[PDB]
Symmetry: D2
Subunit: 415 residues, 4 copies
């Protein structure tokens, strides 16, 4: 309670004149090993298209929305014009991009805002891909064209409160009834669920006692998806607690390609390739910001980029970025050549996100105080990395997928 | 848009039944090296006292205020009843506690909530202490009785946009006028500055060319303090941008004991010990949460505590924590005996600060998904640590303070 | 072949004039937090006495011996004059030191040479202590006084080719025979064993199927112990493969206090406190050496200590040292007060080990090329830490000992 | 003294029968991202030839030689027959391999023995290359053919006691006299120098004040090279202190293409790509050995590979190896494409080197006790990695080479 307590925050141009905030997004200086050499002409055109659009459309508004933990619904039709949704799905009204074209688009979104990327990743590299790989021809033709336009939104429900890392032992049931299925259970952390038109729900078929997948609809009687508050990262992403009580799904809406967790495993493997590319994008952005910031901000009568400790940290981030990118690039190519094991994807995601965590640490301390401000990207990025390091399998779970594959010995279960 | 988009969040007890959230604070398990042995009877009594008060009064409401970036004003008299504000200042209405007493109280506050400790710390171990050291006996008798009971609040303005790490090159001017002084300049990041009744403004005396100190008042004409938004950590702390335009301050509100920057470094050495104790407590709280969570939460039919990977992470935290306490404790003992150099104070704050960053990182990934949720503390703590790692000297600035002392060569300025 | 190939190496004063080799041992600048304040006047006396002797007697010759992987037998009587061997054993011709005194001398020995410390450690803290804690009055008086003078050397044989980390399941058998026992099996890695007078051999008593302990004598029929070659660290220590072929040990030389692994486990805990002081010692040595080296060595027109990067590495070391020391210190008091658990000793030894590794790594790179020369200590110290990080239980085994204790759930056995 | 003290060590098959030592070299499992996909068929063939030669000829003999710190001269005609010496030099009796061809060759040599690698690299990528890039046709035709056959050995002398990192400022002098030059000064750390036939000595022309390069011959009047003893890594490489007192060098032996430091600095960037590949090779070997050791060695009734903690380490190493290779591979393509900058070569060398250090650290602790024995490779490579992390420019110096380039500000010089 003062004369000034109620007053609107001081404008950034007056509050910190020395540096530019992320509204005017930093230029790409993280690309140090000339990555366009590794990209097809079509892939280069997508990279710059996604980037120009994210910097113009999303960067100026992301700070507000991230702070309020609100989703920028108005940005959806643009993201659908970007032709990103539907990744590498061929036909059914999808763009039919290369896995690498999709991967670099993923990074180019994540570079600017990780929530938008997660939004699309969950919608497209999980939601749509599960329909593409596991759906009927009828389902694909019915559901994908619109999903690709972003006229409808998908989400992907696997995780439960009782079942997170231990996904194959999920407890959401699916009971065969007359004319379809009856779904019962509870799902947790499902991004988009609070407004998704389509909800791919993984439920245990109670006849076969194996895991099946079902396309649930928005507003189905017995369905309730509600917002998870107080997240420190991915604040624009709407993560849902879902309740299903005798939610009905007709025969035609069961995914025929999901007959046990082995198929969910096959989806997650391809999905982990796309998730790997999020930390790559984020790291690229953090460096870009850090690079500009350090050159702009002056202390002790010199740019902050003049000091040894600041340079060592800047180059450490820079090396991490080149390696991560190449790491993610190889992964894509392994997939394309049809020779990719789940262990290779797990390691891709585990390793990359670990080095990204490291990179965000350094990038965060490099901006000093402003490094904790959403305004300057890094804080946002630093916070957004944490759940990414957790989802699509934790670091520990992913390294054990690889460890099992590389050694021949499962090491998940307790003594 | 949905029939359930607007609905309130699911109750945590139904949302995630397995683990209990921070609103019911975890028991102390972090204290593995029986630290009460290093505490005197009245030092123990205070540890107990603040602990209970923080768990009962602050824990149940800290989630929602932190999320909304609001200060919990209703909580301030309860903190004033604890008799911790005023620190080690003898007399003048203050508690006259030992340095070690002040330190674990700083830790036990930070254990539950870092924002609250920061508020107290800038108020008591910066605001009140500069009055207690650099003040006249008059300034002591007038402001200190009210500041100790928390009936009035203090802040401490050194940092500004152009001068943060280079505090010595402070730009804010102080022209001499009859009756007193006019303050012209700008400050930034100042904790409590939006509602502080007293604002200790550091400004350059244009007559002597040196930095001085001025107790400016709330609602002084020309003075505007405005909240800094979009912080990722220390969200309840009201850090401000301060505009000073011809701000009048009479002869009696100037601090007679600060005629040079040298005087501010004298104070900053003592504060850097209290600040060193923030990460200690925060890290204790993190281990405390983690210990209980890993025992409650089951995965693959076992508690999360049963897994090698988790036990290692938890044990690394434990070790870190013991070492951090011992480090801070010796830092108090060096102060108590009048042999503490600034380098010693800096090493402590740097080292402890760093190991906390490491501890929080481990703690955060130990909780999986829920580790990003403020409701479970470790997410709050993980974020709160970043600012703490940065302010009162960055890790780098502090290390080069020690570096200069121990090699005789200053390495702050560039080539 | 060359006209200079066979010529002796260049003298250090000529080959590298700028910096002093370890032969003139550096002054103690690692003690930054004034550690004598935590020691009794007796504890201070020993620290000093043990340093004076290590610097004068061992430093000038330790390089030549560490390179040839040889033990300096002539050094033995000088070590037994220090009054170290025996440790905390009360009576029976032992010095009856405090636990902290025995801990400090270990650090001061390890500070100059780690091999020398490991010699004394295996001898006094493992070998002699086993006779104190599990021996009978008869054999305590028979063997201990000679051991404390170092007129005779002891070793401690637990590890086997098949049982290192899994010591509880050892396979060396001890067959009850008229008038004593017959020992059969192999031991690996036993320090001093190639010249030890007393070999404490742990073997499975074939009547009870539990581990027992036996005092075996040098040159006993069926005993042969050979050096382990090609060691990168602790190269002065004579580690042996012991082959035991029907070795006769009479009823009088069976330790009546060892009746299962629980007794040998009781011993390891007290020993791990002393081992924990070794990396403390070594890290002090590395710092002391680096500090002097960065002031003497000059590059780009200034002392290496002038550079931001070097100063930070040095300060990081300095921070670790102070924390490691306090950690070892607190651990001693825990033991002195009868409140030490095995899990507390395991934490000390795990954490301090890990911190030393970090320190040595930093310390090694700081000296550039000379950082890989035994002459300049760091290289020797750096290598020596590696087996210390492994023996007395690996970092992982010790982590899980603490792990099991704090969680109450064992996590050693596989999935 | 003992009846068994002078006996030879126990043969490994009886000492530790559970695991196979490096003398029988492990199969390649570190190639997890199918690296041959990124190599030309010529490059795959070279990779194959070198690997089979190193495993057959060097692995069975390396342990004894590394421990004695002696060079295996008898291996020279084999290494010569591999067709590596000469690297990418086209013509003049050299094999004219591609850049990646020489890179993978480097790695495969280093994979088995780092000393052998450094031997060839200093001879080929420094000695021979300096003549190719900076020699006259007359001296290229005269010296290279025999050098490519290893019938003569070259070395490359830049460093001196007073100039290591600051190489630009060396004090070795070249005075113009009738018929040629007289070289005066001292050199340190020069590999192959005790037996090298040709010695490329860099010395400051006294007329022009710039660094020049001179082909000095073995046993030249005034030349004395002596072995630097007591190294902990690359123990097989013969590094020298070189003494030059009025060493005469004829006009025809002055490299006419070396006129200032920027000529030698241009060579350093090309050879720095090759050095980068040394860590890549070594890490692969470390992984390869670990993989096999962890499957073979049983403890607690399971392979060491069965335990979470061990799998995590193993997978972290594997992640690193993939990233390092891709990193090294990309660097080669940047050079092949003619677009490499010093900063990029510096970044590669710095980053890859640091990752290899982390890897060696993990691989070392994964083998327990035996991880300190040269017999099981890991120990040797761990140690070998330290000089590699230091030479060809340090981590600090290399990072600052990139820092200067990306930021535009040099930060080598002190305040
Ligand atoms: S966004 C949402 C993202 N969510 C996730 O990523 C969830 C993370 N969890 C997972 O990915 C998986 O649950 C997991 C990797 C942790 C384990 O899954 P899984 O072991 O492959 O499936 P599961 O059905 O448990 O496997 C059955 C058996 O196959 C075994 N198996 C052995 N080798 C295997 C191999 N190479 N591949 C697959 N399974 C193998 C498993 O060990 C298990 O045997 P046990 O019953 O004896 O333990
Ligand atoms: S919430 C509060 C947030 N802010 C903080 O905590 C403040 C962090 N900043 C600082 O501590 C300081 O700005 C600082 C340590 C970086 C300033 O350095 P400083 O040297 O101690 O202060 P200053 O008064 O400028 O010293 C003047 C000269 O003393 C020299 N000096 C040498 N030894 C010194 C010593 N032991 N102590 C102080 N100054 C010393 C300095 O080198 C400097 O000369 P140059 O600039 O030519 O090299
Ligand atoms: S220099 C020489 C240095 N050598 C060493 O330090 C040896 C390293 N090894 C060790 O310390 C031990 O062998 C070890 C800790 C790895 C295992 O020993 P241990 O578990 O303490 O005793 P051990 O006899 O194996 O115990 C058998 C049972 O007691 C159980 N136990 C439970 N709590 C226990 C406790 N607090 N203390 C001891 N044992 C406990 C063990 O878990 C084990 O049960 P499981 O059958 O379910 O696995
Ligand atoms: C932002 C966000 C979005 C998400 N979106 C979706 C979504 O769209 N769809 C969906 O289905 N799910 C989603 N999830 C859930 C996500 O997949 C889970 O957070 C994660 O996969 C499971 O972890 P958990 O939260 O259950 O924690 P837990 O599984 O309890 O793990 C806690 C800790 O224990 C460790 N651990 C667990 N098991 C072992 C083991 N066997 N050995 C060693 N260590 C172990 C883990 O590494 C982790 O550190 C989302 C989560 C987040 C945070
Ligand atoms: C939550 C919060 C609360 C705060 N509260 C207060 C307060 O109450 N009172 C107050 O006065 N201030 C306060 N501050 C400001 C804080 O003290 C400053 O952030 C910090 O001391 C100076 O950093 P800066 O933000 O100016 O960034 P900079 O000073 O520009 O530093 C940016 C980076 O450059 C590095 N760097 C700077 N100088 C050098 C150098 N010479 N050599 C090598 N590296 C260098 C730093 O390590 C840092 O990584 C607060 C800040 C935060 C985030
Ligand atoms: C220099 C030196 C001196 C020694 N002196 C003595 C002596 O005097 N007396 C004596 O009795 N012994 C001695 N030893 C033996 C030493 O105590 C053992 O090396 C150690 O206790 C067991 O290691 P190991 O060599 O058998 O390796 P292993 O037990 O094979 O372990 C290999 C790796 O696997 C990991 N690992 C093992 N078990 C598990 C598990 N359950 N879960 C997860 N990870 C696991 C370990 O952490 C380690 O990294 C000495 C060793 C050295 C190196
Ligand atoms: C096995 C081995 C083989 C070698 N072979 C050869 C050879 O064949 N030919 C040859 O010419 N040389 C050779 N060298 C020398 C090698 O290139 C040098 O050791 C290296 O360039 C660094 O020199 P230095 O050892 O004097 O380190 P120093 O220059 O003494 O540096 C010591 C420390 O100070 C730091 N430092 C130095 N300058 C700065 C700065 N400006 N800013 C921040 N930090 C700084 C460094 O990072 C390092 O940690 C060899 C060295 C080794 C170990």
């Amino acid at each position: 309670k003062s004369s000034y307590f109620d007053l609107p925050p001081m404008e950034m141009s007056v509050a910190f004149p020395q540096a530019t905030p992320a509204s005017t997004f930093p230029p790409c200086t993280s690309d140090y090993y000339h990555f366009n050499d590794l990209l097809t002409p079509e892939e280069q055109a997508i990279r710059k298209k996604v980037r120009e659009c994210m910097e113009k459309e999303v960067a100026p508004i992301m700070t507000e929305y991230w702070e309020k933990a609100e989703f920028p619904f108005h940005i959806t039709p643009k993201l659908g014009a970007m032709g990103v949704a539907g990744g590498s799905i061929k036909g059914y009204g999808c763009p039919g991009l290369s896995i690498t074209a999709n991967a670099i688009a993923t990074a180019e979104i994540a570079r600017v805002d990780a929530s938008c990327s997660t939004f699309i990743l969950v919608h497209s590299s999980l939601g749509m891909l599960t329909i593409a790989l596991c759906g009927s021809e009828a389902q694909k033709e019915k559901y994908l064209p619109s999903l690709a336009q972003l006229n409808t939104v998908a989400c992907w429900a696997l995780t439960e409160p009782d079942n997170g890392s231990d996904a194959s032992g999920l407890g959401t049931t699916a009971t065969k009834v007359e004319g379809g299925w009856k779904i019962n259970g509870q799902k947790r952390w499902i991004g988009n669920s609070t407004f998704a038109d389509l909800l791919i729900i993984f439920a245990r078929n109670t006849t076969t006692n194996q895991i099946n997948g079902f396309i649930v609809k928005k507003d189905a009687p017995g369905l309730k998806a509600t917002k998870i508050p107080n997240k420190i990262g991915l604040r624009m992403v709407q993560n849902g607690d879902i309740l299903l009580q005798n939610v009905f799904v007709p025969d035609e809406d069961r995914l025929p390609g999901v007959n046990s967790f082995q198929d969910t495993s096959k989806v997650l493997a391809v999905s982990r390739v796309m998730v790997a590319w999020q930390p790559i994008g984020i790291s690229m952005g953090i460096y870009d910001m850090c690079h500009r910031y350090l050159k702009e901000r002056k202390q002790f009568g010199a740019p902050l980029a003049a000091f040894q400790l600041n340079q060592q940290k800047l180059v450490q981030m820079l090396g991490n970025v080149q390696a991560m990118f190449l790491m993610g690039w190889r992964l894509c190519k392994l997939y394309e050549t049809g020779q990719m094991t789940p262990g290779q994807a797990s390691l891709g995601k585990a390793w990359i996100s670990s080095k990204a965590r490291e990179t965000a640490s350094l990038g965060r301390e490099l901006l000093g105080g402003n490094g904790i401000l959403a305004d300057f990207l890094v804080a946002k990025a630093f916070c957004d990395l944490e759940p990414i390091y957790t989802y699509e399998g934790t670091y520990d779970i992913n390294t054990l997928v690889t460890g099992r594959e590389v050694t021949g010995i499962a090491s998940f279960k307790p003594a």
